[PDB]
């Protein structure tokens, strides 16, 4: 219920990554690596939240807005538990993290983040040195800067053009909805006077026979905007359409679909620049290395034609999909001071206990480990199935607490040997509670 930004501290780095290694920083190709270790005050409790905010020059997804899912819940790599659940509000350049009861059940809470974030060209219309990018974790801001250098538009004689994909959502291997993509074309950014100007956009290139792009009247939608004289177009293709005039309806009879995945827009005589947004559906593919290529060409009287285009590769994540799915079990050996067989707030883990997992039906040992400082353990890479977890090497003088108390199998003790079931998720309920009886030395009289 409370903002605890003031109760977290962090050690953070933000570094631009020249992904293509071409010694130029460009929002469409490059990104930012955010890394942080966050410490949370013990006063923090379940339902409290902290924020991560980021400057106007930063966004948390690139071409695929669905990629926002890559920045999610913060989890403990040592015991599998979720520490805080994440919720995005990109309109407010905000990520909010709400703590789970993890922070009630453990002290000395720490979290790590390792994110790839992106440059937002919205406020970077032109090439500019020392553009600042920053991120604010709780109340602590981290900054870095880069020199942004965009490519020139392409021109031949008085013809000029530029283009970029602005959005791509590929669902390769899916036949019913293969996904969609958008390309924006700048026509006549030089603002020359042209006559009989025509734009041709085509998902065709002789060097890329295997091409998932697709342009036809069935699947393609086109919007056209006119920019006023001297208007400075955004070089990152991040277009503020509210500032332009939507003239799509004046082109209704000027748009012609043609052969081999082409569409033609007849501009006639122009002297303004125009922004053409082409939205279309991917073709279905079984390729595993899908390639998209889409070219744009402007012709006009008395000038040589000029062509540009964009290509992108995709990674067919379905085909193969890393040998099915595996999950982890395990998670907690605690000192059950209560002796109630129930994990209570205030009780803590026991280090150095050996844990072994065997496949109940199959055969035997599928994993083994030892509890850490916090009593936590994990056994990774388990398929669905029934497992016998066995605890051993209890510390001298310790006794096993009553098994399966209460009606909550997540908060009880399993006993040194039990069977748990993995099915589509981690099973972290294989826990053991132990206690130390007072020393009972020698005889009594």
Residue numbers at the binding site for Ca ion (CB under 5 A) = 18, 20, 22, 24, 29-30, 331-332, 336, 338, 340, 342, 344, 409, 412, 414, 428-429, 431
| Phi/psi at 75 (5° precision) | -125, 160
Looking at beta carbons only, is 29 or 360 nearer to Ca ion? Answer: 29
Q: E strand or H helix at 431, and its extent?
A: strand 427-435
- Between residues 88 and 436, which has the closer beta carbon with respect to Ca ion? 436
**Least Å from the CB of residue 376 to Ca ion:** 9
292 φ/ψ sector (left φ>0, alpha ψ -120 to 50, else beta): beta
Local structure of residue 369 (DSSP, 8 states): E
When the beta carbons of 18 and 122 are compared against Ca ion, the nearer one is: 18
- For residue 286, the Cα-to-chain-centroid distance in whole angstroms is 24
Closer of 79 and 136 to Ca ion (Cβ):
79
Compare residues 80 and 213 and give the one whose CB is closer to Ca ion.
80
Least Å from the CB of residue 73 to Ca ion = 17
User: CA-based Rg of the chain, rounded to a whole angstrom?
Assistant: 30
At its nearest, how many Å lie between Ca ion and the CB of residue 404?
Answer: 7
Kindly tell me which of 250 and 408 has the beta carbon lying closer to Ca ion. Answer: 408
Q: Among 84, 83, 109, 82, which Cα is nearest to 96's?
A: 84
Burial bucket for residue 227 (CB in 10 Å: 0-12, 13-18, 19+): buried
What is the torsion angle, in degrees rounded to the nearest 10, for the CA atoms of residue 99, residue 101, residue 104 and residue 105? -130
Residue with Cβ nearer Ca ion (21 or 252): 21
Backbone angles phi, psi at 401, to 5 degrees: -80, 165
Residue 31 in contact with residue 19, Cβ under 8 Å? Answer: yes
Structure-block tokens of residue 382:
């388990």
Q: Which is nearer to Ca ion, 261 or 336 (CB)?
A: 336
396 vs 437: CA distance, rounded Å: 11
Kindly state the smallest distance separating residue 127's Cβ from Ca ion, in Å.
13
Cβ proximity to Ca ion: between 66 and 373 the closer is 373
Rounded to the nearest whole angstrom, what is the least distance from the CB of residue 430 to Ca ion in the complex?
6
Residue the block writes with tokens 């999610």: 72
| Residue closest to 330 by CA, chosen among 357, 349, 353 | 357
Residue nearest to Ca ion (CB): 338
Please name which of 22, 343, 299, 58 lies closest in space to residue 187, comparing C-alpha atoms: 299
**Minimum distance from residue 148 beta carbon to Ca ion (Å):** 10
CA dist 305 and 301 (Å) reads 9
Comparing CB distances to Ca ion, the nearer of 48 and 336 is 336
Q: Of 89, 107, 121, whose CA–CA distance to 44 is shortest?
A: 107
CA distances, 144 to each of 134, 410, 442 (Å): 6, 44, 68
The distance of closest approach from Cβ of residue 277 to Ca ion in the complex, given in angstroms and rounded to an integer, is: 25
Please, is 267 exposed, middle or buried when counting C-beta atoms within 10 Å of its C-beta (0-12, 13-18, 19+)? buried
The rounded distance, in Å, linking the Cα atoms of 268 and 193 is 10
């Amino acid at each position: 219920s409370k903002n605890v930004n003031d109760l977290i501290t962090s050690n953070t780095t933000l570094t631009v990554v020249d992904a293509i290694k071409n010694n130029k920083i460009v929002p469409a190709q490059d990104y930012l690596a955010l890394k942080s270790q966050i410490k949370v005050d013990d006063k923090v409790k379940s339902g409290d939240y902290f924020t991560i905010k980021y400057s106007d020059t930063v966004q948390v997804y690139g071409l695929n807005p669905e990629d926002i899912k890559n920045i999610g819940d913060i989890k403990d790599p040592n015991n599998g538990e979720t520490i805080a659940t994440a919720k995005h509000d990109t309109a407010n350049n905000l990520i909010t993290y709400t703590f789970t009861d993890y922070v009630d059940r453990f002290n000395s809470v720490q979290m790590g983040i390792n994110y790839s974030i992106y440059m937002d060209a919205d406020t970077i219309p032109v090439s500019k040195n020392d553009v600042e990018f920053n991120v604010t974790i709780g109340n602590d801001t981290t900054k870095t800067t880069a020199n942004i250098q965009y490519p020139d538009y392409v021109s031949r004689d008085n013809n000029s053009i530029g283009s970029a994909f602005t959005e791509t959502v590929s669902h390769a291997g899916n036949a019913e909805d293969p996904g969609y993509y958008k390309q924006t074309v700048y026509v006549n950014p030089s603002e020359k006077s042209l006559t009989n100007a025509k734009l041709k956009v085509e998902a065709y290139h002789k060097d890329y026979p295997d091409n998932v792009g697709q342009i036809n009247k069935d699947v393609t939608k086109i919007k056209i905007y006119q920019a006023p004289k001297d208007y400075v177009l955004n070089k990152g293709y991040d277009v503020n359409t509210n500032q332009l005039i939507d003239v799509t309806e004046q082109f209704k009879d000027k748009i012609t679909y043609g052969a081999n995945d082409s569409v033609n827009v007849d501009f006639g005589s122009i002297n303004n620049s125009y922004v053409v947004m082409v939205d279309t559906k991917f073709e279905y593919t079984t390729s595993a290395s899908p390639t998209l290529v889409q070219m744009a060409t402007l012709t006009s009287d008395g000038n040589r034609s000029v062509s540009t285009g964009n290509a992108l590769g995709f990674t067919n994540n379905q085909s193969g999909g890393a040998a099915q799915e595996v999950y982890k079990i395990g998670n907690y050996v605690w000192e059950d001071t209560n002796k109630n067989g129930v994990q209570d707030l205030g009780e803590v883990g026991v280090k150095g206990v050996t844990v072994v997992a065997y496949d109940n039906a199959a055969a035997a040992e599928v994993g083994r480990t030892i509890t850490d400082d916090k009593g936590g353990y994990l056994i990774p890479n388990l398929p669905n199935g029934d497992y016998r977890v066995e605890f051993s090497n209890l510390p001298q003088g310790y006794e096993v607490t009553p098994s399966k108390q209460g009606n909550n199998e997540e908060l009880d003790s399993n006993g040194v040997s039990s069977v748990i079931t993995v099915n589509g998720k981690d099973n972290l309920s294989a826990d053991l509670g132990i206690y130390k009886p007072k020393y009972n030395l020698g005889d009594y009289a």
